[PDB]
Short mmCIF file of C-alpha atoms in Angstrom, two decimals:
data_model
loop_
_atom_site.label_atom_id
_atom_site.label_comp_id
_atom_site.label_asym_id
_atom_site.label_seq_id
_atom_site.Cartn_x
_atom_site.Cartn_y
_atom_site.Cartn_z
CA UNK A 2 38.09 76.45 -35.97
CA UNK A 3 34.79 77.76 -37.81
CA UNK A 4 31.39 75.14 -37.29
CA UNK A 5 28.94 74.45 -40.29
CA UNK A 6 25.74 72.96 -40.56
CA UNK A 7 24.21 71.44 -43.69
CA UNK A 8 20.47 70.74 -43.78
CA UNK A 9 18.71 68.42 -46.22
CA UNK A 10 14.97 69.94 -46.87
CA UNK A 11 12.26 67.08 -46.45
CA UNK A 12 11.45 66.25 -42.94
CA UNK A 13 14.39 67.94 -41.92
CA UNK A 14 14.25 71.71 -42.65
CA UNK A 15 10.32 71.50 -43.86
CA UNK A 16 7.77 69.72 -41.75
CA UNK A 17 5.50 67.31 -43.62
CA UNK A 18 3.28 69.76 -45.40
CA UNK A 19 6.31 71.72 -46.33
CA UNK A 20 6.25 74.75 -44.07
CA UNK A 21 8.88 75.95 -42.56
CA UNK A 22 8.56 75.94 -38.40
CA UNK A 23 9.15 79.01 -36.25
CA UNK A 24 11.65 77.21 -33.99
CA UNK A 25 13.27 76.40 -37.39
CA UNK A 26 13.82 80.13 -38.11
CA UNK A 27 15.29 80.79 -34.59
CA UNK A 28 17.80 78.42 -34.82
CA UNK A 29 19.29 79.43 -38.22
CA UNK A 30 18.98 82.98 -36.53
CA UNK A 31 20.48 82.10 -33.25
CA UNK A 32 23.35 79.79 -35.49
CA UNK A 33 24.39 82.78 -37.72
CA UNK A 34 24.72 85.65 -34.61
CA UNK A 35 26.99 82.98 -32.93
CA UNK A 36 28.99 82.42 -35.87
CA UNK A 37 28.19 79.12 -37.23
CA UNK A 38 28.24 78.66 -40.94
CA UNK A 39 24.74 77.50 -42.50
CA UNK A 40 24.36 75.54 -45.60
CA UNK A 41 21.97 72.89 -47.29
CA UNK A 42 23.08 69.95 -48.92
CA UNK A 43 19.94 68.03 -50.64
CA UNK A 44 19.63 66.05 -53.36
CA UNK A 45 17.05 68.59 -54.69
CA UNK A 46 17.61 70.83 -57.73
CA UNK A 47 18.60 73.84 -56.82
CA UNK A 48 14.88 75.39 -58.51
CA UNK A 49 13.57 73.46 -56.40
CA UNK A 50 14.31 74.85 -52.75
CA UNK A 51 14.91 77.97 -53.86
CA UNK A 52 12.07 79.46 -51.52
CA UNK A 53 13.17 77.67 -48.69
CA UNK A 54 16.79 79.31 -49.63
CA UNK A 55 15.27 82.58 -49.78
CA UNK A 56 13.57 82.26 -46.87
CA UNK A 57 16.68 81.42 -44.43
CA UNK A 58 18.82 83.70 -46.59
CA UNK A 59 21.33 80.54 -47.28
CA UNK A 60 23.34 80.84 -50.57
CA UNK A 61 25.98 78.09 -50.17
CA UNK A 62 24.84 74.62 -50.85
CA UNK A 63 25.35 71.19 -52.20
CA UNK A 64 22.66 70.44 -54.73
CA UNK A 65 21.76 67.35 -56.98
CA UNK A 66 23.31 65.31 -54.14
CA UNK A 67 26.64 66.84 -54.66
CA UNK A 68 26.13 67.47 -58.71
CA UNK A 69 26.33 71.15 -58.34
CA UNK A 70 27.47 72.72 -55.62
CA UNK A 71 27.23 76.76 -54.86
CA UNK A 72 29.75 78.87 -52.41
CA UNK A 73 28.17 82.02 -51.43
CA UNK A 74 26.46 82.81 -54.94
CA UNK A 75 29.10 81.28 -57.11
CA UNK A 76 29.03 78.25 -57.93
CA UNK A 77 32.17 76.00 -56.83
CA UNK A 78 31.60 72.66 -58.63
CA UNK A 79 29.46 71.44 -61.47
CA UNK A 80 29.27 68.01 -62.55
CA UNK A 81 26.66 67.41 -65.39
CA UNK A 82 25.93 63.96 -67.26
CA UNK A 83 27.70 63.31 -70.24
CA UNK A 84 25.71 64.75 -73.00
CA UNK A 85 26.37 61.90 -75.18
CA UNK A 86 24.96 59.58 -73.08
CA UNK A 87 21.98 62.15 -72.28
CA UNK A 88 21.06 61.71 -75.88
CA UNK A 89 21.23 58.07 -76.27
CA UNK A 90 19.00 57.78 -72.87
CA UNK A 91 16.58 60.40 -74.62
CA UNK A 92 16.86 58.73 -78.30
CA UNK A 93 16.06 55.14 -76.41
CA UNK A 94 13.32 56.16 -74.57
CA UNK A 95 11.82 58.28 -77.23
CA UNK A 96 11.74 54.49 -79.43
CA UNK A 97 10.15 53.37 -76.36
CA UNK A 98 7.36 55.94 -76.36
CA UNK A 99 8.48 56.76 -72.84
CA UNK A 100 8.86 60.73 -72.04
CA UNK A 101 11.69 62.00 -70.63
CA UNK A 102 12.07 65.51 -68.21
CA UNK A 103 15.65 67.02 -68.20
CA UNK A 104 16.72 69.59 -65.27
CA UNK A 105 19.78 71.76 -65.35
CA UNK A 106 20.26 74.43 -62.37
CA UNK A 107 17.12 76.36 -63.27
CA UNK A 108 14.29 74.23 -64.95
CA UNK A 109 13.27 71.32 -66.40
CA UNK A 110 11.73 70.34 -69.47
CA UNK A 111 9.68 67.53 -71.30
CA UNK A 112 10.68 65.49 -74.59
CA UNK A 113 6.73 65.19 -74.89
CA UNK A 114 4.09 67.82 -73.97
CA UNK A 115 0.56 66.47 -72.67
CA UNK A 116 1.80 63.64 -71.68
CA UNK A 117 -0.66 60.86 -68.89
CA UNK A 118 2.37 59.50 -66.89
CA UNK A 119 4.01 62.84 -66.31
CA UNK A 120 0.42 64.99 -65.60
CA UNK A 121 0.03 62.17 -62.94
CA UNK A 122 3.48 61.66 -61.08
CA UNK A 123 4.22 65.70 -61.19
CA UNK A 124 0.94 66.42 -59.67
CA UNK A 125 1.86 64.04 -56.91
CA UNK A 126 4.49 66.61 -56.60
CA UNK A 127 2.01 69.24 -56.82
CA UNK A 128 3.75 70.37 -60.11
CA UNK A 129 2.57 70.90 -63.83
CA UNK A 130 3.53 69.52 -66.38
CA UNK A 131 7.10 70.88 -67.54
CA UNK A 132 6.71 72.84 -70.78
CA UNK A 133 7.96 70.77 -73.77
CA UNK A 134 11.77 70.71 -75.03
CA UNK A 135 12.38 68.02 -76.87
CA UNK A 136 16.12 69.32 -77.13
CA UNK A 137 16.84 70.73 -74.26
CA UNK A 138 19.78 68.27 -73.69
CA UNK A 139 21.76 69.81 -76.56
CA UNK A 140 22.52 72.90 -75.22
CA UNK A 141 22.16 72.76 -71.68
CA UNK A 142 24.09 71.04 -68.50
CA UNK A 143 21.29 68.12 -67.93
CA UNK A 144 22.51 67.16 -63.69
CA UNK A 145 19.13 64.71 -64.01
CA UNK A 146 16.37 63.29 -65.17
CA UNK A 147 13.00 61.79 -65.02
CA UNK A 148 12.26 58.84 -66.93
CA UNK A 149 8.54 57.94 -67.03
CA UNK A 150 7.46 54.57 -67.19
CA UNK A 151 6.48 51.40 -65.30
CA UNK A 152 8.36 49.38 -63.08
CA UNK A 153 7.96 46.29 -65.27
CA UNK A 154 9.50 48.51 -68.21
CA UNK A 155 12.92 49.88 -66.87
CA UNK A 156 14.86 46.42 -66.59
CA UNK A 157 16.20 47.57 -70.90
CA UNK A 158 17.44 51.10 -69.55
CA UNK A 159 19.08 49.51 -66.43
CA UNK A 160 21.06 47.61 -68.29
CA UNK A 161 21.90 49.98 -70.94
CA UNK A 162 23.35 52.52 -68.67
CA UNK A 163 25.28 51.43 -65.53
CA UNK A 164 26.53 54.59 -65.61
CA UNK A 165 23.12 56.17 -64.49
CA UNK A 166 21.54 54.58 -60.96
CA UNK A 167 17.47 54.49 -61.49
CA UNK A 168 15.69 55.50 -58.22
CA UNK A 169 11.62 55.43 -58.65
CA UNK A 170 9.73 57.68 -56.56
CA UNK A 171 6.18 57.34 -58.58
CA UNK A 172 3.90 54.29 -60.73
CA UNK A 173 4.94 55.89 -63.69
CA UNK A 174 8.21 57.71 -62.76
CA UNK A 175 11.81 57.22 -61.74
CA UNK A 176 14.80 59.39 -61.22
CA UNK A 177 17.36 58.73 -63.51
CA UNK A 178 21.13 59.87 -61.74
CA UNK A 179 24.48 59.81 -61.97
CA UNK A 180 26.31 56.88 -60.66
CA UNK A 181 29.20 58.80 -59.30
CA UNK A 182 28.70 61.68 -56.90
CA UNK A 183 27.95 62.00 -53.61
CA UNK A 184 26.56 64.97 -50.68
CA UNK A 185 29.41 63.79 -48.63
CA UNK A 186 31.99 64.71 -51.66
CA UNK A 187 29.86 68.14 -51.97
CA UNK A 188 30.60 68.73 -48.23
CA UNK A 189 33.69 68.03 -48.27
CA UNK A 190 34.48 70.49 -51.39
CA UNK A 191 33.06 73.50 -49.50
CA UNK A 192 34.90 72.68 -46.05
CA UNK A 193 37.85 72.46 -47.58
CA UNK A 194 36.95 76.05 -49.48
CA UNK A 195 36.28 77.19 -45.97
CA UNK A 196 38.82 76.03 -44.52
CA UNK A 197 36.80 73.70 -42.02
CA UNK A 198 37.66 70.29 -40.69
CA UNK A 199 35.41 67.22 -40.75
CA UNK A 200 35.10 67.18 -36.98
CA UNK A 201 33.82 71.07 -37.21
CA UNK A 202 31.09 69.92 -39.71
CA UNK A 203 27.17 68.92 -38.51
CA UNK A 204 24.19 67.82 -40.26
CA UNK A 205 20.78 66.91 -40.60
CA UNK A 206 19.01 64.68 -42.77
CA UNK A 207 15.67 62.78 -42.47
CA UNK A 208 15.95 59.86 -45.66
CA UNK A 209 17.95 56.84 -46.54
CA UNK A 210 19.58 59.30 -49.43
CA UNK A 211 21.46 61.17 -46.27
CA UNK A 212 23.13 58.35 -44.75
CA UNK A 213 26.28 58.73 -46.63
CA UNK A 214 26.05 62.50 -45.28
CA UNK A 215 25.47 61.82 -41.98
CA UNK A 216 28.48 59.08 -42.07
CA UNK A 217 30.74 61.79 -43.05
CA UNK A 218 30.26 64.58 -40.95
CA UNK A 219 31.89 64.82 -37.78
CA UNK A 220 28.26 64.91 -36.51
CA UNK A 221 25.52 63.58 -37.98
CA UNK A 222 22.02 64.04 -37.06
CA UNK A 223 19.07 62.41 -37.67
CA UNK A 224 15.54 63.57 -37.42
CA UNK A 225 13.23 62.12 -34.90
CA UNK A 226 11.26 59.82 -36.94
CA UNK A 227 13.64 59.07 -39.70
CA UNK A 228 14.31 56.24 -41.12
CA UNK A 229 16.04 53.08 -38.52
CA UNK A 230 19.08 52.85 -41.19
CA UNK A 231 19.28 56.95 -40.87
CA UNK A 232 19.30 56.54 -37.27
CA UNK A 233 21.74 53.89 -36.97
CA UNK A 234 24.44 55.93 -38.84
CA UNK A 235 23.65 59.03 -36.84
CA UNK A 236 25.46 60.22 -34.03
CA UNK A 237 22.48 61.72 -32.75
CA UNK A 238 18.75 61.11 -32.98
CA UNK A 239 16.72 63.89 -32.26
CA UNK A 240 12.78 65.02 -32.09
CA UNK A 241 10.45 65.33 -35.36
CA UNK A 242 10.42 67.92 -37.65
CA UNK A 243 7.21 68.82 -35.75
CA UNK A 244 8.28 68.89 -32.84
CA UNK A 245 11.29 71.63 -33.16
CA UNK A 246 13.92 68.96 -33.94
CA UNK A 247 16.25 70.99 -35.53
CA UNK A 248 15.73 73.75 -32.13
CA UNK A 249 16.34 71.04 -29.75
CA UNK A 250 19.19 69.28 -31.50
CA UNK A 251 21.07 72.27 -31.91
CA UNK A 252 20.81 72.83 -28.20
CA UNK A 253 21.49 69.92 -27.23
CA UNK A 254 24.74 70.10 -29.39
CA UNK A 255 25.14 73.00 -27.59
CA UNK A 256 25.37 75.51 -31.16
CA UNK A 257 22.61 77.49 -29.89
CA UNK B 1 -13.56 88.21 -80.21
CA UNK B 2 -11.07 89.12 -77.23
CA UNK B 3 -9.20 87.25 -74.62
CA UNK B 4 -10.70 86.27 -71.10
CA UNK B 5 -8.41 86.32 -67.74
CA UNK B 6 -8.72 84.71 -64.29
CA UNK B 7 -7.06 86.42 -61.44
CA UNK B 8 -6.52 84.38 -58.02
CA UNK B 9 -5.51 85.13 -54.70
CA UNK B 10 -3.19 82.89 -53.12
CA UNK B 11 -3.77 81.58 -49.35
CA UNK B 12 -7.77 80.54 -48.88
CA UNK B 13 -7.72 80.53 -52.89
CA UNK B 14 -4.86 78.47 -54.63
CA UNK B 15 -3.47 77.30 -51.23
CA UNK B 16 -6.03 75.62 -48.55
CA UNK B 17 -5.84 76.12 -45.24
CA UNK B 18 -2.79 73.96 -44.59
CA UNK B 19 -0.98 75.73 -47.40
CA UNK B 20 -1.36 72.80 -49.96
CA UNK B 21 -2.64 73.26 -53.38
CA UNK B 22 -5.23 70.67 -54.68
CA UNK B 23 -4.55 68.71 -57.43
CA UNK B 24 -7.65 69.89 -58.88
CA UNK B 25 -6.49 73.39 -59.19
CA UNK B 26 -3.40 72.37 -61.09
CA UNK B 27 -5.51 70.81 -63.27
CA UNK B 28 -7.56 73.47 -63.65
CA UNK B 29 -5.35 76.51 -64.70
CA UNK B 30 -4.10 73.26 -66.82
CA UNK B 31 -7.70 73.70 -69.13
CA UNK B 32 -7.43 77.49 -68.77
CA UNK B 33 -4.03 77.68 -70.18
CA UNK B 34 -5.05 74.98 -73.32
CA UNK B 35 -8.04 77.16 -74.08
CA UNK B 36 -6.21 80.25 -74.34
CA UNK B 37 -7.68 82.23 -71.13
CA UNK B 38 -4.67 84.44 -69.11
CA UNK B 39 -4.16 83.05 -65.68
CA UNK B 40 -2.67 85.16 -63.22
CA UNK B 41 -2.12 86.03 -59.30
CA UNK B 42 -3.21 89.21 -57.99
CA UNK B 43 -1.11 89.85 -54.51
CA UNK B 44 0.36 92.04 -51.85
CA UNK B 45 3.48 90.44 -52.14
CA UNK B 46 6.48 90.34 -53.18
CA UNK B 47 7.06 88.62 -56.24
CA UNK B 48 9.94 86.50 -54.23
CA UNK B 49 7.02 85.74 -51.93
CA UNK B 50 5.16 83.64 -54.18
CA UNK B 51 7.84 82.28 -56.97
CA UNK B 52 7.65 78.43 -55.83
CA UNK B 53 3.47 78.86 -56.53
CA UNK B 54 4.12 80.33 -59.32
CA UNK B 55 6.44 77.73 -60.59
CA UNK B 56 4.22 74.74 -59.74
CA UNK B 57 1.38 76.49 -61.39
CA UNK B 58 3.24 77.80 -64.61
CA UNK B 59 2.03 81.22 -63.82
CA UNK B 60 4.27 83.89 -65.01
CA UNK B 61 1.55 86.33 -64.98
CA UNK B 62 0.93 88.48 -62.19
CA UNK B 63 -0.35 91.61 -60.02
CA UNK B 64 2.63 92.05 -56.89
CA UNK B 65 2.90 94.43 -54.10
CA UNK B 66 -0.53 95.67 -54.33
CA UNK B 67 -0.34 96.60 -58.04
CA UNK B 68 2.70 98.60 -57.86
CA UNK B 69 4.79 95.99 -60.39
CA UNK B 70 2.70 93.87 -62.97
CA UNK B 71 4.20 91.24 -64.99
CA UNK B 72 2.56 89.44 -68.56
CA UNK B 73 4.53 86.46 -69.44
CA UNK B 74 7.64 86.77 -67.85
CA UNK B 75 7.59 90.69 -68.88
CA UNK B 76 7.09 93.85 -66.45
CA UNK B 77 3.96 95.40 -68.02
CA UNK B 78 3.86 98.30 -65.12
CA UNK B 79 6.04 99.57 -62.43
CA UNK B 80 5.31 102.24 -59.79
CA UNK B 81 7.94 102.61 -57.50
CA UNK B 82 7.20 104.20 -54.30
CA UNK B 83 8.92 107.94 -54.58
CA UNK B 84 12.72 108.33 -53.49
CA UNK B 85 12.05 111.35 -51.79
CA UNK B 86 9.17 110.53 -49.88
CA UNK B 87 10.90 107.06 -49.05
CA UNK B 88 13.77 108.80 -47.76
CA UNK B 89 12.06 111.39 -45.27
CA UNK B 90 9.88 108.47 -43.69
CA UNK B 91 12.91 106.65 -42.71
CA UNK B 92 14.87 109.72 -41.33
CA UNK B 93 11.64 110.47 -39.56
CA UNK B 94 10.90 106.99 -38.56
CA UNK B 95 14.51 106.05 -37.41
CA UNK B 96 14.02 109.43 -35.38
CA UNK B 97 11.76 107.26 -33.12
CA UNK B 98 13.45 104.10 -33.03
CA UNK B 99 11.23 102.54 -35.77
CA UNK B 100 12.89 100.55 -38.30
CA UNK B 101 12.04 100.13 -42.13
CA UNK B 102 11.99 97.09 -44.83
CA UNK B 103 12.69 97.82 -48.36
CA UNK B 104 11.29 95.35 -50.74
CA UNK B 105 11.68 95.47 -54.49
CA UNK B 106 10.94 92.46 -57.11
CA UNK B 107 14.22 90.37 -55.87
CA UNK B 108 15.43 90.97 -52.51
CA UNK B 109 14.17 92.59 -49.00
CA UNK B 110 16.48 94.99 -46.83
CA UNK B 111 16.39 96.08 -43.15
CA UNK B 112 17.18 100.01 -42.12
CA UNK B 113 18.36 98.37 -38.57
CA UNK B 114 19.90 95.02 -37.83
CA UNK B 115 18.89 92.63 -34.98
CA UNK B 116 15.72 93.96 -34.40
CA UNK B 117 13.31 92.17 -32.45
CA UNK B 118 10.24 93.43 -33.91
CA UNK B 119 11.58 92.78 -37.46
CA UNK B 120 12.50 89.10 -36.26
CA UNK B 121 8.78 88.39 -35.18
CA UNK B 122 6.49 89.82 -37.99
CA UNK B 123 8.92 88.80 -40.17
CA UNK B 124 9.14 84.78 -38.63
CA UNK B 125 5.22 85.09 -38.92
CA UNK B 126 5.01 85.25 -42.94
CA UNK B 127 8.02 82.92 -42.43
CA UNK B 128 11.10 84.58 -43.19
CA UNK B 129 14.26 85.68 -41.52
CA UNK B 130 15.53 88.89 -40.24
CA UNK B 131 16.34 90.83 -44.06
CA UNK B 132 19.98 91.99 -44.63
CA UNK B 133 21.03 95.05 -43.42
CA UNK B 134 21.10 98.06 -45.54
CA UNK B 135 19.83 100.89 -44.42
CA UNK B 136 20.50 102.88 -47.71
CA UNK B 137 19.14 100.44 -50.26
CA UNK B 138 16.41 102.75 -51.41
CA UNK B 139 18.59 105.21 -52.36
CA UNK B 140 20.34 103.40 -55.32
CA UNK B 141 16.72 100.57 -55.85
CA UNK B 142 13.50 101.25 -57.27
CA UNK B 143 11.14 100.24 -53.92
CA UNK B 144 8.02 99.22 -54.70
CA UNK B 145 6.40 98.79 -50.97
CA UNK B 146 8.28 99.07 -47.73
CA UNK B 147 7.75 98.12 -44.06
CA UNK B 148 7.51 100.38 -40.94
CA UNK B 149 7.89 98.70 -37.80
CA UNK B 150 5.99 100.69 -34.97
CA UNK B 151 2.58 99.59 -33.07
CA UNK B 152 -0.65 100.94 -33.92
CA UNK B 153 -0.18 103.42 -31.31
CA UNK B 154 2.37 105.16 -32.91
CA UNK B 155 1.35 105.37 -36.77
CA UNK B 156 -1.13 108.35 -36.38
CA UNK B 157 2.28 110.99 -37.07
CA UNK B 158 3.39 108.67 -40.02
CA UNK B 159 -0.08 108.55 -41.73
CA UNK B 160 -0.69 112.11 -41.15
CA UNK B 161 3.13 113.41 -42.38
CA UNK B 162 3.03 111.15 -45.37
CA UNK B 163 -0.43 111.38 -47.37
CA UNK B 164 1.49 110.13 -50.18
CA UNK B 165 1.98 106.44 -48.88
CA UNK B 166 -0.98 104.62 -47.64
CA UNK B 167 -0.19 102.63 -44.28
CA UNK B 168 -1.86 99.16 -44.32
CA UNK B 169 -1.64 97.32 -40.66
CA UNK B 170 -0.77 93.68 -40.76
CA UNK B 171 0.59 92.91 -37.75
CA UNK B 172 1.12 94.12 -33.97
CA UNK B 173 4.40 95.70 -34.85
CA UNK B 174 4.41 95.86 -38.79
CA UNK B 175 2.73 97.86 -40.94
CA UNK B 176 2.37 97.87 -44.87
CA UNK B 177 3.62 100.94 -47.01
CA UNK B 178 2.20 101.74 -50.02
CA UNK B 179 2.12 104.63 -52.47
CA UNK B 180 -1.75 106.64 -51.60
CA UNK B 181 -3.74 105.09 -54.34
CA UNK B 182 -2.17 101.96 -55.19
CA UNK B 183 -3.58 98.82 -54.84
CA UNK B 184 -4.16 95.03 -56.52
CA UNK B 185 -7.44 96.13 -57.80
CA UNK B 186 -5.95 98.58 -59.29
CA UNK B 187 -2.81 96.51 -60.85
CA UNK B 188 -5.24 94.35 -62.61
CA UNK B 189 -6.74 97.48 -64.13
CA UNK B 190 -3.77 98.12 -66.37
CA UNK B 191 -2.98 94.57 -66.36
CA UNK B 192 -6.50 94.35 -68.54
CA UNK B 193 -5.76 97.63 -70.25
CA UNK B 194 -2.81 96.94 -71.61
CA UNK B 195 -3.59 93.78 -72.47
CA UNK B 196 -6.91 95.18 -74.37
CA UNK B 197 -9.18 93.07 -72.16
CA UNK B 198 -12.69 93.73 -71.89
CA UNK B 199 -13.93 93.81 -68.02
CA UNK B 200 -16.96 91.45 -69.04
CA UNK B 201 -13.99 89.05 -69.73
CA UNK B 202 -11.88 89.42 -66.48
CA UNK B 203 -12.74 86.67 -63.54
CA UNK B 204 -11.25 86.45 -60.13
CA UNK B 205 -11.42 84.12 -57.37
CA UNK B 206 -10.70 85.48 -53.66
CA UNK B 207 -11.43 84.48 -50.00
CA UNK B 208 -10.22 87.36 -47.75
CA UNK B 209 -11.73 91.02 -47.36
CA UNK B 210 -8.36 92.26 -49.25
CA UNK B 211 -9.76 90.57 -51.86
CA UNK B 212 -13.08 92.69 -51.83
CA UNK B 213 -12.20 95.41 -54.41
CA UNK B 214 -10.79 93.22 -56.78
CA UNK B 215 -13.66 90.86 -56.64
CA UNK B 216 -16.10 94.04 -57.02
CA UNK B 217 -14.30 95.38 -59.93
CA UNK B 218 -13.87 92.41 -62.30
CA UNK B 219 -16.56 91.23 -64.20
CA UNK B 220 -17.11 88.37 -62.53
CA UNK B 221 -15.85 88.39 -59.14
CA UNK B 222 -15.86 84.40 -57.62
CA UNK B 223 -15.81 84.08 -53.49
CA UNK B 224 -14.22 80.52 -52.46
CA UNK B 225 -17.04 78.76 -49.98
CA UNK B 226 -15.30 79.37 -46.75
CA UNK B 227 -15.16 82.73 -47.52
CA UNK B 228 -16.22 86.32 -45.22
CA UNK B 229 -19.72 87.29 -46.19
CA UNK B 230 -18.31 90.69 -47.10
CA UNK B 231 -16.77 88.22 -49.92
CA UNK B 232 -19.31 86.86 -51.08
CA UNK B 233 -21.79 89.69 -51.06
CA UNK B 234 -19.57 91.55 -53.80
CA UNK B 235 -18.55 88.21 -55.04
CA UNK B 236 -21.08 87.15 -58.40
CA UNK B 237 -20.81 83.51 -57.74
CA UNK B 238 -19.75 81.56 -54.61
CA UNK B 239 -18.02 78.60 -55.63
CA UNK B 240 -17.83 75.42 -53.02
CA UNK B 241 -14.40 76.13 -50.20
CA UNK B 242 -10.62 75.50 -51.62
CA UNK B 243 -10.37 71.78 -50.38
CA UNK B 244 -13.67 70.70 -52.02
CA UNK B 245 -12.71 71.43 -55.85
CA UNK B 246 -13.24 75.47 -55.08
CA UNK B 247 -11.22 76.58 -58.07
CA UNK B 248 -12.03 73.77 -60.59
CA UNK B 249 -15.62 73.94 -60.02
CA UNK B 250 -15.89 77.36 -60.15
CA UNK B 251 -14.31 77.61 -63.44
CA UNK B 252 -16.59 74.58 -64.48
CA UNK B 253 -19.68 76.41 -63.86
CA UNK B 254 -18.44 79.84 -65.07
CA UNK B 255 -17.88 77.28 -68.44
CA UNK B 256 -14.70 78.22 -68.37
CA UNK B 257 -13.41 74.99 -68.63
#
């Protein structure tokens, strides 16, 4: 039976100023010559980690953690939010005065252009601001979005939507995501395309958001100084980022 | 009266040393944009090579592979592709002596030979893995710059068959290919002539020596502190390094922001 690999991107495939390692490269190389299929599985938008996809020549993934996934190119499954409830989110917010960013496969865009909390939070990201589309929603298969406001604020949007799970990365930001969904489901949709069994399947993740990944897998792997929950669910803990974790892992697992 | 246009380089000018780009900056091509002044990268590379920049700056502008393909808001505005014929004799001849080729275009990269260890290590260096193999892909794809793998030792016969292409060393076992008289200098010439741009209007901010002609030829040509004095003796103004507000500074005391 075939092996696969999925990688999550942050800490795990990048080190912490988002360069790629040399060791990093060898063992994708190394991986693919022996014949052992390599994918990503993030919750990232695909735009996103499109560089690093280039860069490793990977086109199979599980993006949007497990939202939209992509087999070789093509894209296998595609789960959007419900563009009703898109609206209502965006038509709430807008009464609110709070500004909204919406991201399909390829982009995202702003219901307000110019706008103090997104400048700030996206430039944490080292991003711009997203150019303004009000309604971008309309036409358009929305897999997330930003809402920006404070903490203190969200408790009204909460509640309106227990459909959508609020995760805040920023002061003035917080993803807004759909409550069903999963990297685990995404990996399990391409193995079975693949024809590859659970107990074939390895991966590596770095944040609390890859615990339900690394629980599924056959073997999961967590990065050297991830989280203790990510640890605790791995069946392997191996060295930093910086310090060729994802070389000496895959050694140790004897893949490479 | 007319429009104005910065140019920038992109490691030691956009990036810092550590590859990050300073908030500053992003605020910077920010004002630019607002006030109605083109902002644009001038490169060697591949436009795949710099895409994620380019996203988190907004910049859809741009001078890639050395001026050979030039793009104005999302739009090619000039394309020079490196000549089929001449393309194809320099791999026959090169694959003669065991050195292998990389064809790049505006999307994708391709390999004349697979597993090869000298592609592998020039190629890991700029951080990418070994390209697909295709050893054909200039026949049927407009190339706009190509890679010959072979030390320095070996390139006299190349650069003497082939006056045509101009070959650019970059590593130990990788050298550039270019067409004989192309280069980023010369991209943002058309760039400003087909945009109708006076030269007393175009700005550019560099760090490296390949960023001396371009920093000569524009109006105002803008070395980043840290930069070689060969920079900054061509360079009009000498703006503090790229982790100490280089870019926004710069632009501040040019007044254009």
């Amino acid at each position: 039976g075939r092996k696969i690999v999925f990688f999550d991107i942050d800490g795990t495939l990048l080190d912490e100023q988002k360069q790629l390692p040399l060791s990093t490269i060898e063992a994708v190389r190394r991986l693919k010559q022996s014949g052992v299929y390599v994918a990503i599985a993030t919750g990232r938008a695909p735009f996103m980690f499109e560089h690093v996809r280039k860069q490793l020549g990977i086109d199979s993934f599980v993006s949007f953690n497990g939202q939209y996934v992509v087999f070789e190119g093509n894209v296998l499954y595609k789960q959007p939010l419900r563009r009703e409830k898109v609206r209502a989110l965006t038509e709430e917010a807008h009464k609110n005065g709070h500004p909204l960013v919406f991201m399909d496969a390829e982009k995202m865009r702003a219901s307000i252009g110019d706008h103090p909390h997104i400048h700030v939070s996206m430039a944490s990201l080292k991003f711009a601001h997203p150019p303004v589309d009000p309604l971008y929603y309309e036409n358009k298969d929305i897999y997330q979005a930003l809402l920006f406001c404070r903490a203190e604020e969200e408790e009204p949007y909460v509640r309106n939507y227990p459909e959508f799970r609020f995760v805040r990365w920023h002061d003035v930001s917080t993803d807004v995501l759909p409550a069903g969904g999963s990297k685990a489901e995404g990996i399990r949709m391409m193995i079975e395309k693949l024809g590859i069994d659970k107990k074939d399947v390895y991966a590596f993740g770095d944040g609390l958001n890859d615990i339900e990944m690394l629980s599924f897998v056959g073997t999961g792997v967590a990065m050297g100084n991830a989280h203790e929950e990510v640890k605790r669910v791995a069946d392997f803990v191996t060295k930093p980022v910086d310090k060729e974790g994802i070389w000496y892992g895959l050694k140790q697992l004897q893949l490479i």
